[PDB]
Coordinates of C-alpha atoms in Angstrom, one line a residue:
Chain A
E1 CA 89.3 53.4 -44.1
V2 CA 88.6 52.0 -41.0
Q3 CA 91.9 52.1 -38.6
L4 CA 92.4 51.0 -34.9
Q5 CA 95.8 52.2 -33.5
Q6 CA 96.9 51.0 -30.2
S7 CA 99.6 52.3 -27.6
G8 CA 103.3 51.1 -27.4
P9 CA 104.7 48.4 -25.3
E10 CA 104.7 49.1 -21.5
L11 CA 107.3 47.9 -19.0
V12 CA 105.5 47.8 -15.3
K13 CA 106.4 46.4 -12.2
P14 CA 104.0 44.4 -10.2
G15 CA 101.2 45.8 -8.3
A16 CA 101.1 49.0 -10.6
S17 CA 98.4 50.0 -12.9
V18 CA 98.4 50.7 -16.6
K19 CA 96.1 52.5 -19.2
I20 CA 95.8 50.8 -22.7
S21 CA 94.4 52.8 -25.5
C22 CA 92.9 52.3 -28.8
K23 CA 92.1 55.1 -31.1
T24 CA 89.4 54.8 -33.4
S25 CA 88.8 56.4 -36.9
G26 CA 86.6 55.7 -40.3
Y27 CA 83.4 54.9 -38.5
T28 CA 80.5 55.9 -36.2
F29 CA 82.0 55.1 -32.8
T30 CA 78.9 55.7 -31.0
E31 CA 76.8 52.9 -32.0
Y32 CA 79.5 50.1 -32.5
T33 CA 80.5 47.8 -29.5
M34 CA 83.9 47.5 -28.6
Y35 CA 85.5 44.4 -26.9
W36 CA 88.7 43.6 -25.2
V37 CA 90.6 40.5 -24.9
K38 CA 93.9 39.1 -24.0
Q39 CA 96.3 36.4 -25.2
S40 CA 99.0 34.9 -22.9
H41 CA 102.2 33.4 -24.6
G42 CA 101.7 29.8 -25.9
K43 CA 98.0 29.3 -24.5
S44 CA 94.9 29.9 -25.7
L45 CA 92.9 33.2 -26.0
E46 CA 90.5 34.8 -23.6
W47 CA 87.8 37.5 -23.5
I48 CA 87.7 40.1 -20.9
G49 CA 84.7 42.4 -21.5
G50 CA 82.7 44.6 -23.5
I51 CA 81.5 48.4 -23.5
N52 CA 78.7 50.0 -25.3
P53 CA 79.6 53.6 -26.0
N54 CA 76.0 55.0 -26.5
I55 CA 75.0 54.0 -23.2
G56 CA 77.8 52.8 -20.9
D57 CA 76.5 49.1 -20.2
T58 CA 79.2 46.7 -19.4
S59 CA 79.7 43.1 -18.9
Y60 CA 83.0 41.9 -17.6
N61 CA 84.1 38.0 -17.5
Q62 CA 84.0 36.5 -14.0
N63 CA 87.4 35.7 -13.7
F64 CA 88.4 39.7 -14.7
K65 CA 85.9 41.4 -12.3
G66 CA 88.4 43.0 -10.1
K67 CA 91.0 43.0 -12.6
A68 CA 90.1 45.3 -15.4
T69 CA 87.7 48.6 -15.8
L70 CA 86.6 49.8 -19.0
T71 CA 86.2 53.9 -19.6
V72 CA 85.0 55.5 -23.2
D73 CA 86.3 59.1 -24.2
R74 CA 83.8 60.1 -26.8
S75 CA 85.2 63.8 -26.9
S76 CA 88.4 61.9 -28.9
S77 CA 86.7 58.6 -29.8
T78 CA 89.2 56.8 -27.9
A79 CA 88.5 53.6 -25.4
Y80 CA 90.4 52.8 -22.3
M81 CA 91.4 49.7 -20.1
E82 CA 92.9 50.0 -16.6
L83 CA 94.2 46.8 -15.2
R84 CA 94.8 46.5 -11.4
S85 CA 96.8 44.3 -8.8
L86 CA 98.9 42.8 -11.6
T87 CA 100.9 39.8 -10.9
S88 CA 103.5 37.7 -13.1
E89 CA 100.5 36.0 -14.8
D90 CA 99.7 39.1 -16.9
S91 CA 102.5 38.6 -19.4
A92 CA 100.3 38.9 -22.1
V93 CA 99.4 40.9 -25.2
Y94 CA 96.0 43.1 -25.1
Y95 CA 93.9 43.8 -28.5
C96 CA 90.8 46.1 -29.0
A97 CA 88.0 44.8 -31.0
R98 CA 84.8 46.2 -32.7
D99 CA 81.3 44.5 -33.0
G100 CA 79.4 44.3 -36.2
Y101 CA 76.0 43.5 -35.6
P102 CA 74.5 46.6 -37.7
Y103 CA 76.2 45.1 -40.8
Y104 CA 74.8 41.6 -40.8
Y105 CA 78.1 40.5 -39.3
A106 CA 79.7 38.8 -36.0
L107 CA 82.6 40.6 -36.7
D108 CA 85.4 41.6 -33.7
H109 CA 87.8 43.2 -36.3
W110 CA 91.1 43.2 -34.1
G111 CA 93.3 46.0 -33.8
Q112 CA 97.2 45.9 -33.2
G113 CA 98.0 44.7 -29.7
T114 CA 100.2 46.2 -26.8
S115 CA 102.8 43.7 -25.6
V116 CA 102.5 44.3 -21.5
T117 CA 105.3 42.6 -19.6
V118 CA 105.7 42.2 -15.8
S119 CA 109.0 42.1 -14.0
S120 CA 111.2 43.4 -11.0
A121 CA 114.0 44.0 -12.4
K122 CA 116.1 47.0 -13.8
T123 CA 117.3 47.1 -17.5
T124 CA 120.7 45.1 -17.7
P125 CA 122.8 45.3 -20.7
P126 CA 123.9 41.7 -22.2
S127 CA 127.0 40.0 -22.0
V128 CA 127.7 37.9 -24.7
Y129 CA 129.8 34.4 -24.4
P130 CA 131.1 32.4 -27.6
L131 CA 130.7 28.7 -27.8
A132 CA 133.8 26.3 -28.5
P133 CA 133.0 24.1 -31.4
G134 CA 136.1 23.1 -30.7
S135 CA 139.6 22.9 -32.2
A136 CA 139.1 21.4 -35.6
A137 CA 137.6 19.0 -37.9
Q138 CA 134.3 18.3 -35.7
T139 CA 133.0 17.2 -37.9
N140 CA 134.7 16.8 -41.3
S141 CA 132.0 18.0 -43.3
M142 CA 130.1 20.8 -41.6
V143 CA 131.2 22.7 -38.4
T144 CA 128.7 24.5 -36.1
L145 CA 129.4 27.7 -34.2
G146 CA 127.2 29.8 -32.0
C147 CA 127.3 32.8 -29.2
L148 CA 125.2 32.9 -26.0
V149 CA 123.4 35.6 -24.2
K150 CA 122.6 35.8 -20.3
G151 CA 121.2 38.4 -18.1
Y152 CA 119.7 41.1 -20.2
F153 CA 116.6 43.2 -20.1
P154 CA 114.3 43.7 -21.9
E155 CA 113.5 41.8 -25.4
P156 CA 114.9 41.9 -27.9
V157 CA 118.4 41.9 -29.1
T158 CA 119.3 41.9 -32.6
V159 CA 122.1 39.0 -33.0
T160 CA 123.9 39.5 -36.6
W161 CA 126.3 37.1 -37.7
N162 CA 129.5 38.4 -39.5
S163 CA 127.6 42.0 -39.3
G164 CA 124.6 41.0 -41.4
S165 CA 126.4 39.0 -44.1
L166 CA 126.0 35.3 -43.2
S167 CA 122.6 34.3 -43.5
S168 CA 123.0 30.4 -44.7
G169 CA 121.2 28.8 -41.6
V170 CA 121.2 31.6 -38.9
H171 CA 119.0 29.9 -36.0
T172 CA 118.2 32.5 -33.3
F173 CA 116.2 30.3 -30.6
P174 CA 113.5 32.5 -28.6
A175 CA 114.4 33.9 -25.2
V176 CA 113.4 31.8 -21.9
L177 CA 113.5 32.9 -18.2
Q178 CA 116.0 31.3 -15.8
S179 CA 116.8 34.0 -13.0
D180 CA 114.1 36.6 -14.1
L181 CA 116.3 37.5 -16.7
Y182 CA 116.1 36.6 -20.5
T183 CA 118.6 34.7 -22.2
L184 CA 118.8 32.9 -25.7
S185 CA 121.4 31.4 -28.4
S186 CA 122.2 31.4 -31.8
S187 CA 123.4 28.6 -34.3
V188 CA 125.1 29.1 -37.4
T189 CA 126.7 26.5 -40.0
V190 CA 130.1 27.7 -41.6
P191 CA 131.4 25.1 -44.0
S192 CA 135.0 23.9 -43.6
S193 CA 136.5 25.7 -46.5
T194 CA 136.6 29.2 -44.4
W195 CA 136.8 28.5 -41.1
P196 CA 139.1 28.7 -39.2
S197 CA 141.1 30.4 -42.0
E198 CA 138.8 33.3 -41.9
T199 CA 137.0 35.4 -39.1
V200 CA 133.4 34.5 -38.1
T201 CA 132.4 36.7 -35.3
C202 CA 128.8 37.1 -33.7
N203 CA 127.3 40.8 -33.2
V204 CA 124.8 41.3 -30.4
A205 CA 123.4 44.8 -29.9
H206 CA 120.7 46.0 -27.5
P207 CA 118.4 48.9 -28.6
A208 CA 117.4 49.5 -25.1
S209 CA 121.0 50.1 -23.8
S210 CA 122.6 51.1 -26.9
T211 CA 125.7 49.0 -26.2
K212 CA 127.2 47.1 -29.4
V213 CA 129.1 44.1 -28.4
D214 CA 131.1 41.6 -30.9
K215 CA 133.0 38.4 -29.8
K216 CA 135.2 36.7 -32.3
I217 CA 134.9 33.0 -32.4
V218 CA 138.4 31.5 -31.6
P219 CA 139.3 27.7 -32.3
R220 CA 140.1 26.1 -29.0
Chain B
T1 CA 25.3 74.6 -38.4
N2 CA 27.6 72.0 -36.3
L3 CA 31.1 73.4 -35.3
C4 CA 33.9 71.3 -35.6
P5 CA 35.1 69.8 -32.5
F6 CA 38.4 71.0 -32.8
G7 CA 38.4 72.0 -28.8
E8 CA 37.9 68.2 -28.2
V9 CA 41.3 67.2 -28.9
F10 CA 42.6 70.5 -27.6
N11 CA 41.3 70.8 -24.3
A12 CA 41.3 67.1 -23.5
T13 CA 42.1 65.5 -20.2
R14 CA 44.3 62.6 -21.3
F15 CA 46.9 62.9 -24.1
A16 CA 49.0 60.3 -25.6
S17 CA 52.6 59.6 -25.6
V18 CA 54.5 59.7 -28.8
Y19 CA 54.9 56.3 -29.6
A20 CA 51.3 55.5 -29.4
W21 CA 49.9 58.9 -30.7
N22 CA 46.3 58.9 -31.3
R23 CA 44.5 59.9 -34.4
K24 CA 40.8 60.6 -35.4
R25 CA 39.6 62.4 -38.3
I26 CA 37.2 65.3 -38.5
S27 CA 34.5 65.7 -40.9
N28 CA 31.2 67.0 -41.7
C29 CA 31.3 70.5 -40.3
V30 CA 32.1 73.7 -40.7
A31 CA 35.7 75.0 -39.5
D32 CA 36.3 77.8 -37.0
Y33 CA 40.4 78.3 -37.6
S34 CA 40.1 82.2 -36.5
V35 CA 39.6 81.7 -32.8
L36 CA 42.5 79.1 -32.7
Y37 CA 45.1 81.5 -33.9
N38 CA 43.5 84.5 -32.0
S39 CA 43.6 82.5 -28.8
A40 CA 46.7 84.1 -27.5
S41 CA 47.3 80.5 -25.4
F42 CA 49.8 78.8 -27.9
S43 CA 53.5 79.2 -28.2
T44 CA 54.5 78.2 -31.7
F45 CA 51.9 78.6 -34.4
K46 CA 53.7 77.7 -37.5
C47 CA 52.4 76.5 -40.9
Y48 CA 54.3 74.1 -43.6
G49 CA 52.8 75.0 -47.3
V50 CA 49.6 76.8 -46.5
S51 CA 49.5 80.6 -45.3
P52 CA 48.2 80.3 -41.6
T53 CA 45.8 83.4 -42.1
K54 CA 44.4 81.9 -45.4
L55 CA 42.7 78.6 -43.9
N56 CA 39.0 79.9 -43.9
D57 CA 38.4 80.1 -47.4
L58 CA 40.7 77.6 -49.2
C59 CA 39.2 74.4 -47.7
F60 CA 40.1 70.8 -47.6
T61 CA 38.3 67.4 -47.8
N62 CA 39.8 65.7 -44.5
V63 CA 41.7 66.8 -41.4
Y64 CA 43.8 64.6 -39.2
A65 CA 44.6 65.4 -35.5
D66 CA 47.6 64.0 -34.0
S67 CA 48.1 64.5 -30.4
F68 CA 51.3 63.4 -28.3
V69 CA 53.4 64.9 -25.6
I70 CA 57.1 65.8 -26.1
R71 CA 59.9 67.5 -24.4
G72 CA 60.4 71.4 -24.9
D73 CA 64.0 71.0 -26.7
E74 CA 62.3 68.5 -29.2
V75 CA 59.4 70.4 -30.7
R76 CA 61.8 71.5 -33.4
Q77 CA 62.3 67.9 -34.4
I78 CA 58.4 67.8 -35.9
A79 CA 59.2 69.9 -39.0
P80 CA 59.6 68.8 -42.6
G81 CA 63.1 67.4 -42.9
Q82 CA 64.6 67.5 -39.7
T83 CA 66.6 64.8 -37.8
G84 CA 67.1 63.7 -34.0
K85 CA 65.8 60.8 -31.9
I86 CA 62.2 61.7 -31.7
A87 CA 61.8 62.7 -35.3
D88 CA 63.0 59.4 -36.9
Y89 CA 62.0 56.6 -34.2
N90 CA 58.5 58.0 -33.1
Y91 CA 56.9 60.7 -35.6
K92 CA 57.9 61.5 -38.8
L93 CA 56.5 64.3 -41.2
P94 CA 57.4 64.4 -45.2
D95 CA 58.5 66.6 -47.5
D96 CA 54.9 67.4 -49.1
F97 CA 53.4 67.7 -45.8
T98 CA 50.8 70.6 -46.4
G99 CA 49.4 71.0 -42.9
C100 CA 50.0 73.1 -39.9
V101 CA 51.7 72.5 -36.6
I102 CA 50.5 73.7 -33.2
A103 CA 52.3 73.4 -29.7
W104 CA 52.0 74.7 -26.2
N105 CA 53.0 74.4 -22.9
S106 CA 51.2 71.8 -20.6
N107 CA 53.3 72.3 -17.4
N108 CA 50.0 73.0 -15.1
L109 CA 48.6 69.8 -15.9
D110 CA 51.4 67.1 -16.7
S111 CA 53.9 68.1 -14.1
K112 CA 53.3 66.7 -10.4
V113 CA 55.3 65.2 -7.4
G114 CA 57.2 62.1 -7.7
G115 CA 57.9 62.3 -11.6
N116 CA 55.5 61.5 -14.4
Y117 CA 57.0 58.1 -15.9
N118 CA 53.9 57.6 -17.6
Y119 CA 54.9 59.4 -20.9
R120 CA 57.3 57.1 -22.7
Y121 CA 59.1 57.7 -26.2
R122 CA 61.2 55.5 -28.4
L123 CA 65.2 55.5 -27.8
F124 CA 66.4 52.4 -29.5
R125 CA 64.9 51.3 -33.0
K126 CA 66.3 49.1 -36.1
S127 CA 65.8 51.7 -38.8
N128 CA 64.2 54.9 -39.7
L129 CA 60.3 55.2 -39.7
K130 CA 58.2 55.9 -42.9
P131 CA 56.3 59.4 -42.7
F132 CA 53.1 59.0 -40.8
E133 CA 53.5 55.5 -39.1
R134 CA 53.3 54.4 -35.6
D135 CA 54.8 51.1 -34.0
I136 CA 53.4 49.8 -30.9
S137 CA 55.9 47.0 -30.0
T138 CA 57.8 45.7 -26.9
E139 CA 60.3 43.7 -28.9
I140 CA 64.2 43.8 -27.5
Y141 CA 66.3 45.7 -29.4
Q142 CA 69.4 43.6 -30.1
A143 CA 72.2 46.0 -30.1
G144 CA 75.2 44.0 -30.2
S145 CA 75.8 40.0 -31.4
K146 CA 74.3 38.2 -28.6
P147 CA 70.7 36.9 -29.3
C148 CA 69.1 37.4 -26.1
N149 CA 65.4 35.9 -25.8
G150 CA 63.5 38.7 -24.6
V151 CA 65.6 39.1 -21.6
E152 CA 67.1 42.5 -20.2
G153 CA 71.2 42.2 -20.1
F154 CA 74.3 43.2 -21.9
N155 CA 73.8 44.4 -25.6
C156 CA 70.1 44.4 -25.7
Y157 CA 67.9 46.6 -24.1
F158 CA 64.3 47.8 -23.8
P159 CA 63.1 50.4 -26.6
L160 CA 61.1 52.6 -24.2
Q161 CA 62.0 55.1 -21.8
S162 CA 60.6 57.2 -19.5
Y163 CA 60.4 61.0 -19.0
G164 CA 61.5 63.1 -16.3
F165 CA 58.5 65.0 -16.2
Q166 CA 59.2 66.7 -12.8
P167 CA 58.0 70.4 -12.1
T168 CA 61.4 71.3 -10.7
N169 CA 63.2 71.1 -14.3
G170 CA 64.3 73.6 -16.5
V171 CA 62.4 75.5 -19.0
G172 CA 63.5 73.3 -21.9
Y173 CA 62.7 70.3 -20.0
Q174 CA 59.1 70.8 -19.3
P175 CA 56.5 68.7 -21.0
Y176 CA 54.9 70.3 -24.3
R177 CA 51.5 69.3 -25.8
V178 CA 51.6 69.4 -29.7
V179 CA 48.8 68.7 -32.2
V180 CA 49.4 67.9 -35.9
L181 CA 47.0 69.1 -38.2
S182 CA 47.6 67.5 -41.7
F183 CA 45.1 69.2 -44.3
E184 CA 45.1 66.7 -47.2
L185 CA 43.4 67.7 -50.5
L186 CA 41.8 64.9 -52.8
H187 CA 40.4 65.2 -56.2
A188 CA 37.1 64.8 -54.4
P189 CA 35.2 68.0 -53.5
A190 CA 35.7 69.1 -50.0
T191 CA 33.4 68.4 -47.0
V192 CA 34.9 70.6 -44.0
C193 CA 34.8 74.2 -45.6
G194 CA 34.0 77.4 -44.2
Chain C
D1 CA 80.6 28.6 -19.0
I2 CA 81.0 27.0 -22.3
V3 CA 84.3 24.8 -23.0
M4 CA 85.1 24.9 -26.4
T5 CA 87.4 22.1 -27.1
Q6 CA 89.8 21.5 -30.2
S7 CA 91.6 18.6 -30.9
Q8 CA 94.4 18.0 -31.8
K9 CA 96.3 21.2 -31.8
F10 CA 98.7 20.1 -34.6
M11 CA 97.8 19.4 -38.0
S12 CA 100.3 18.9 -41.2
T13 CA 99.3 19.3 -44.7
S14 CA 101.0 20.2 -47.6
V15 CA 100.1 22.6 -50.4
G16 CA 97.1 21.7 -52.6
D17 CA 95.5 19.5 -50.1
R18 CA 92.1 19.6 -48.2
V19 CA 92.3 20.4 -44.4
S20 CA 89.4 20.4 -41.9
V21 CA 89.6 22.0 -38.6
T22 CA 86.9 21.1 -36.2
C23 CA 86.1 22.0 -32.5
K24 CA 82.8 21.3 -30.3
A25 CA 81.1 23.1 -27.7
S26 CA 79.5 22.0 -24.3
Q27 CA 75.9 23.1 -24.5
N28 CA 73.7 24.0 -27.3
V29 CA 75.4 27.0 -29.2
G30 CA 73.0 26.9 -31.9
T31 CA 74.5 28.8 -35.0
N32 CA 76.2 31.5 -34.0
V33 CA 80.3 30.5 -34.0
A34 CA 83.2 32.2 -35.7
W35 CA 86.6 31.4 -36.9
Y36 CA 89.7 33.5 -36.9
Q37 CA 93.0 33.3 -38.6
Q38 CA 96.3 34.6 -36.7
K39 CA 99.9 35.2 -38.3
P40 CA 102.5 34.7 -35.8
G41 CA 103.2 38.1 -34.2
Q42 CA 100.3 39.7 -36.4
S43 CA 97.0 40.7 -35.4
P44 CA 94.1 38.1 -35.7
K45 CA 91.6 38.5 -38.7
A46 CA 88.1 37.2 -39.1
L47 CA 87.2 34.5 -41.6
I48 CA 84.1 32.9 -40.8
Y49 CA 80.8 34.1 -39.2
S50 CA 77.8 32.1 -38.1
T51 CA 79.3 29.0 -39.8
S52 CA 78.2 29.8 -43.2
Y53 CA 79.4 33.2 -44.2
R54 CA 82.6 34.8 -45.2
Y55 CA 84.0 38.4 -44.8
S56 CA 84.9 41.2 -47.1
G57 CA 88.6 40.3 -48.4
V58 CA 88.9 36.9 -47.2
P59 CA 89.2 34.0 -49.9
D60 CA 86.2 32.0 -51.1
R61 CA 87.9 28.8 -50.2
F62 CA 87.2 29.1 -46.6
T63 CA 84.1 27.5 -46.3
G64 CA 82.2 26.1 -43.2
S65 CA 79.3 23.7 -42.2
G66 CA 77.9 22.0 -39.0
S67 CA 75.7 23.0 -36.5
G68 CA 74.5 22.4 -32.7
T69 CA 77.6 20.6 -31.6
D70 CA 80.1 19.9 -34.1
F71 CA 81.7 22.6 -36.4
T72 CA 84.0 22.1 -39.4
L73 CA 86.2 24.9 -41.1
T74 CA 87.4 23.3 -44.3
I75 CA 89.9 24.5 -46.7
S76 CA 90.0 23.2 -50.3
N77 CA 93.3 24.6 -51.7
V78 CA 95.6 25.9 -49.3
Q79 CA 98.6 27.8 -49.8
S80 CA 101.5 29.3 -47.9
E81 CA 99.8 32.3 -46.7
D82 CA 97.3 29.4 -45.0
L83 CA 100.0 28.9 -42.3
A84 CA 98.5 30.7 -39.3
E85 CA 96.5 30.4 -36.0
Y86 CA 92.9 29.3 -36.1
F87 CA 90.5 29.7 -33.5
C88 CA 86.8 29.3 -32.7
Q89 CA 84.5 31.5 -30.7
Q90 CA 80.7 31.4 -29.5
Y91 CA 78.2 34.4 -29.6
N92 CA 75.4 32.4 -27.4
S93 CA 76.0 33.7 -24.0
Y94 CA 78.2 35.8 -22.3
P95 CA 81.0 35.7 -21.3
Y96 CA 82.4 34.9 -24.8
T97 CA 84.4 31.5 -24.6
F98 CA 87.3 31.2 -27.1
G99 CA 88.6 28.0 -28.4
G100 CA 92.1 26.3 -28.0
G101 CA 93.7 27.2 -31.5
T102 CA 95.3 24.8 -34.1
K103 CA 98.4 25.4 -36.0
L104 CA 99.1 24.3 -39.3
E105 CA 102.2 22.7 -40.8
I106 CA 103.7 21.4 -44.0
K107 CA 104.5 18.0 -44.5
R108 CA 108.1 16.9 -45.1
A109 CA 110.3 13.9 -45.4
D110 CA 111.8 12.1 -42.2
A111 CA 115.1 13.8 -41.1
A112 CA 117.3 13.0 -37.9
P113 CA 118.8 15.9 -36.1
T114 CA 122.4 17.2 -36.2
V115 CA 123.1 17.3 -32.7
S116 CA 126.1 19.5 -31.3
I117 CA 127.4 20.1 -27.7
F118 CA 129.4 23.4 -27.0
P119 CA 131.4 23.2 -23.7
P120 CA 131.8 26.5 -21.6
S121 CA 134.7 29.0 -22.8
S122 CA 137.3 30.4 -21.2
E123 CA 135.3 33.7 -20.8
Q124 CA 132.6 31.4 -19.1
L125 CA 135.4 30.0 -16.6
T126 CA 136.3 33.5 -15.3
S127 CA 132.5 35.1 -15.0
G128 CA 131.1 33.1 -11.9
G129 CA 129.0 30.5 -13.7
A130 CA 128.8 27.9 -16.3
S131 CA 126.3 26.8 -19.0
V132 CA 127.0 23.9 -21.4
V133 CA 124.5 24.0 -24.5
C134 CA 123.2 21.4 -26.9
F135 CA 122.1 22.5 -30.4
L136 CA 119.5 20.4 -32.3
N137 CA 119.2 21.8 -35.9
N138 CA 116.8 20.6 -39.0
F139 CA 114.7 17.7 -37.7
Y140 CA 111.2 16.7 -38.5
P141 CA 108.8 15.8 -36.7
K142 CA 108.4 18.3 -33.8
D143 CA 108.2 15.4 -31.1
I144 CA 111.6 15.0 -29.5
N145 CA 112.8 14.3 -26.3
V146 CA 116.2 15.5 -24.8
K147 CA 118.0 13.8 -21.8
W148 CA 121.2 15.3 -20.1
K149 CA 122.9 12.5 -18.5
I150 CA 125.5 13.7 -16.2
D151 CA 128.0 10.2 -16.0
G152 CA 125.0 8.1 -16.4
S153 CA 122.7 10.1 -14.0
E154 CA 119.8 12.0 -15.7
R155 CA 119.8 15.8 -14.4
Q156 CA 116.8 17.7 -14.3
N157 CA 117.5 20.9 -12.6
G158 CA 118.6 23.7 -14.5
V159 CA 117.6 21.9 -17.8
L160 CA 115.8 24.5 -19.9
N161 CA 114.7 24.1 -23.5
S162 CA 113.7 26.6 -26.3
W163 CA 112.1 25.2 -29.4
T164 CA 111.5 27.2 -32.6
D165 CA 108.7 27.7 -35.1
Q166 CA 109.1 26.1 -38.5
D167 CA 111.5 27.5 -40.9
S168 CA 110.0 29.2 -44.0
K169 CA 112.8 27.9 -46.5
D170 CA 113.1 24.3 -45.6
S171 CA 110.4 23.4 -43.1
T172 CA 112.6 22.0 -40.4
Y173 CA 112.7 22.5 -36.7
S174 CA 115.2 23.4 -34.4
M175 CA 115.7 23.5 -30.5
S176 CA 118.4 24.2 -27.9
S177 CA 118.8 23.0 -24.6
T178 CA 120.8 24.9 -22.1
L179 CA 122.0 23.2 -18.9
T180 CA 123.2 26.0 -16.0
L181 CA 125.2 24.9 -13.2
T182 CA 128.1 26.7 -10.7
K183 CA 131.9 26.1 -11.3
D184 CA 132.8 23.6 -9.0
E185 CA 129.8 21.4 -10.1
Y186 CA 131.0 21.6 -13.7
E187 CA 134.3 20.1 -12.8
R188 CA 133.0 17.8 -10.3
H189 CA 132.5 15.1 -13.2
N190 CA 134.4 14.2 -16.2
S191 CA 132.0 13.5 -19.1
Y192 CA 128.7 15.2 -20.2
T193 CA 126.4 13.7 -23.0
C194 CA 123.3 15.0 -25.0
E195 CA 121.0 12.2 -25.4
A196 CA 118.1 12.8 -27.8
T197 CA 115.7 10.3 -28.9
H198 CA 113.3 10.5 -32.2
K199 CA 111.3 8.2 -34.4
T200 CA 113.7 8.2 -37.2
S201 CA 115.8 5.3 -35.2
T202 CA 115.6 3.1 -32.5
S203 CA 118.6 4.0 -30.5
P204 CA 118.7 7.7 -29.6
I205 CA 121.6 9.8 -31.2
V206 CA 124.7 10.0 -28.9
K207 CA 127.2 12.8 -28.7
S208 CA 129.5 13.5 -25.6
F209 CA 132.5 15.2 -24.6
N210 CA 135.3 14.6 -21.8
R211 CA 136.6 17.0 -18.8

């Protein structure tokens, strides 16, 4: 079974350099040509370059000439991409590929992808903050609640409502950037027959800091 | 009595490359295979199918002489049932090849200063070769998925590559002259015999 | 290089419907183009190469035609697994120029959003800053325009937004609006409103709170 396995996600400071691997198994690594690409968040795809393992010929894109270099290790069937002079514009995922010309193809056969983010901030634990609906009967049919996070790094956090039991209309909005630190919110819909008679709480956990914090929604 | 001109293809002054190897058939003469084995100037004198000392009696109807120059570490690839970049893209021997191959070192004639880039071999090819078949061509081998229009660039390269036949190389990198003798036996009676 | 243009970027087709994805080229690409399929978060897989041939494992409903300039990836009987991101590539001249991308969507009835504003809590009032949020849930279609008015004056600084992808159960959108500001700027004014317009009504949906 032909399988391409890449590395894990790397947090890196600006100006440094990283090495992204793509291990290969299931086929003859010498003949087939390997490409490398880059997909930024929300925008179109872009191509970087390609390397040939039997010879070593390279042809990079003109916008990535002083950005990335490629090396192939035939002793372990592992390719490598080394990025240099990183800036905040390289917040993207990077895939490995495989050409298919000696099989009557035009195939790329993409791998998994390594999420490489850039920042200059130490990992900060989150701080939850509840939302005031507020007091009572707003509206009379269905009342919405919520809980914010502010100032945390890195993605993601696990926002569970009522310790993972309430799931009838949970809308965890994606994270944005306001002060080089991520923030998001969540929106739930609890009917009037249980609030504020019963306790509805918001549980946000951070796997990168191992901090468990919960805040009960209080009617105010 | 006319002896066969086996010394013409052996003591020649201009040999050929392995992708464009020359071939001419010898006929209507008496063979003298005794002085070839007893010449004491060859390196590897091996046969495949016929005993090497039983050539002068059991005779054949036609002989072929394929002369080409290869490296020192690739003379083993000219053998029935072997792989390698020389054996499948330039010159292939079948399993039923009932002839004898003969090789010798040619360092004192095909090694000069500057480097001999005239001897050329085929490194890239589309598929393997059938036995006893040559392919003179200069078509660009498309290695990747980019159709290039006979130009030199990425993912399509030139199929020929020159040799580093310099006299300062090692004993495994010296140019070696090899001749392939293919004794073919038809149901017709023999012509070269003796 | 080649500029591969795709227009539009959004398309909405229900199940059991025929959809056509098109993208143009700048110069004479010839025949060698491609098409891909990218699930949200997952890795892209290949669907069509050289605009007439499928791959090993892709369904037979993905057909392609066109040559020279126009290329069309037509799907006959779409499904729930058809919702992905579709790109087009060229293989004519290095470097390779990918396309823009087209996302598929499910058609739904018109529904107005249910806006909800949340004033900052007392824990925000003792922290260092304040942020008032305006949730918008279960609306269709995607086009919307939120406007934070501060006593009749539209505020533009610190107004951040965060849209969502389509829900896989009701095919509705959701979005949120975060307005960040300091302490005394929150208690400088007396009212705050979250104006949001839509094509489902002439006048925009109004909600507000005092103090």
